[PDB]
Amino acid sequence: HSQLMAQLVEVIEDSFQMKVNKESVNYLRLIRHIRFTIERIKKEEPTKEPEKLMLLLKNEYPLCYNTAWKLIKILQQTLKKPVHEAEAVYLTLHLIPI
Amino acid sequence: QHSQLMAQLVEVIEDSFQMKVNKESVNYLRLIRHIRFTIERIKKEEPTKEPEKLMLLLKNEYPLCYNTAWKLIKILQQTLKKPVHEAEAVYLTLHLIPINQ
Numbered sequence: 570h571s572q573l574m575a576q577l578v579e580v581i582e583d584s585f586q587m588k589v590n591k592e593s594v595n596y597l598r599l600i601r602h603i604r605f606t607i608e609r610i611k612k613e614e615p616t617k618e619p620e621k622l623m624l625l626l627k628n629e630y631p632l633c634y635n636t637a638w639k640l641i642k643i644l645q646q647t648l649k650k651p652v653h654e655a656e657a658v659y660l661t662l663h664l665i666p667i
Numbered sequence: 668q669h670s671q672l673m674a675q676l677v678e679v680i681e682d683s684f685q686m687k688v689n690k691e692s693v694n695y696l697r698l699i700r701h702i703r704f705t706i707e708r709i710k711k712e713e714p715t716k717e718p719e720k721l722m723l724l725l726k727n728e729y730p731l732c733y734n735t736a737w738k739l740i741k742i743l744q745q746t747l748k749k750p751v752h753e754a755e756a757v758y759l760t761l762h763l764i765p766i767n768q
Contacts, residue, residue, distance in 0.1 A: 581766065584731070584735045585731070585767045595765040599762045606755060606759070610743060610749045610755075615752065616752050616755055616758065622757075625761055625762075629762075636680060639679055639683070640680070640702075640705075643675060644709055655715050656709065658717075659720070660701070662721075662725075662728065663702075665764065667698065
């Protein structure tokens, strides 16, 4: 899907008004994710909703991810209630901009 | 309140990122609002509809990456001629975020 991948890349460059770093880990990862999503779509297999997101966030933003978990550690120690993993995902996403 | 708890969460954030949060800024306010909601869901022991919640979060907080992901998803659907699920837009947004920055 050479022309398809090129077109997807162009939409991203136009939209974000940047040129991709084709050297970078983030880019290499994106193209691999797109190639794999193509296959899942062809096969009509479901997306993994949950624990997949966690690994992704850990790899893309280790510092925000681990920061989320230190927050959650303090919350558990204080409030004593269990913490559903989905909470580390939301916090990681709220921390990235800071 | 959870005032001291909040204060302690913010120090930890400041120290992790090697920064000072301007406590008279919109991003100090945004941050603590999201954090109080986390506390409330933990204390009250409430689960979230995770695909549903992420889509809402991303739309509000990463609107450029989210909207661009939806455009890509529609291209894939039209080219491959297959259904695409909502979860794709989410996982694709998360790969774009580090790209836009």
